[PDB]
Design a protein around this ligand. Structure first.
Ligand SMILES: [Cl-]
Length: 171
């Protein structure tokens, strides 16, 4: 398997197959391994980037995850003052981790390359949480807060969905 983005070392985590063939996916179990410190002697810090809309995040998210659905906010939070360390790892996800999560993962790499001299990167190692929150919650409810799951298409949040989308850069 290839080295991480700045070609400094191998990817640390075991991966699983995912739709986007060039991206690296991890399972809920591996996400819990990170959260429980199984890699604490090697990983200085990791950030779970929840790319879902605010109402989805508010209805139940992974403990410590940061909600950064808008590209400009994800870029500001991660690249205005890069999180330095040991390894730093980013894990992106959305509801199913099919579109929003993968898109943000690609966007951040694009921006990371743009502000660096090749092949250096602030975030050389990034993963997608396979199955997104939809598959994580049924496996590890006590690693979520609140302990619930609100789908993007929830019937009571149709207006909230529209309101949020009109704030995005492109549709
Ligand atoms: Cl956006």
């Amino acid at each position: 398997m290839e080295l991480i983005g700045d070609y400094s070392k191998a990817f640390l985590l075991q991966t699983v197959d995912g739709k986007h063939q060039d991206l690296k996916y991890i399972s809920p179990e591996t996400m819990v391994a990170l959260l429980t410190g199984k890699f604490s002697n090697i990983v200085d810090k990791f950030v779970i980037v929840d790319c879902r809309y605010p109402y989805e995040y508010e209805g139940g998210h992974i403990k410590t995850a940061v909600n950064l659905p808008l590209e400009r906010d994800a870029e500001s939070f991660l690249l205005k003052s890069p999180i330095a360390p040991k390894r730093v790892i980013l894990i992106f996800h959305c509801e199913f981790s099919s579109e929003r999560g993968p898109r943000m993962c690609r966007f951040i790499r694009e921006r990371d390359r743009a502000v660096n001299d090749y092949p250096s990167l602030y975030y050389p190692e990034m993963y997608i949480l396979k199955g997104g929150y939809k598959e994580f919650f049924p496996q590890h409810p006590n690693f979520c807060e609140p302990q619930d799951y609100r789908p993007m298409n929830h019937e009571a949040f149709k207006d909230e969905l529209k309101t949020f989308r009109l704030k995005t850069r492109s549709w």
